[PDB]
């Protein structure tokens, strides 16, 4: 659940 260009991949 971390596919945001290295953004807040907390999920």
């Amino acid at each position: 659940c971390h596919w945001l260009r290295g953004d807040m991949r907390r999920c």
Side-chain angles (χ1 to χ4, degrees):
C1 204
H2 59 101
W3 181 235
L4 299 170
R5 257 77 169 112
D7 287 33
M8 288 174 57
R9 58 162 180 264
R10 284 189 167 262
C11 198

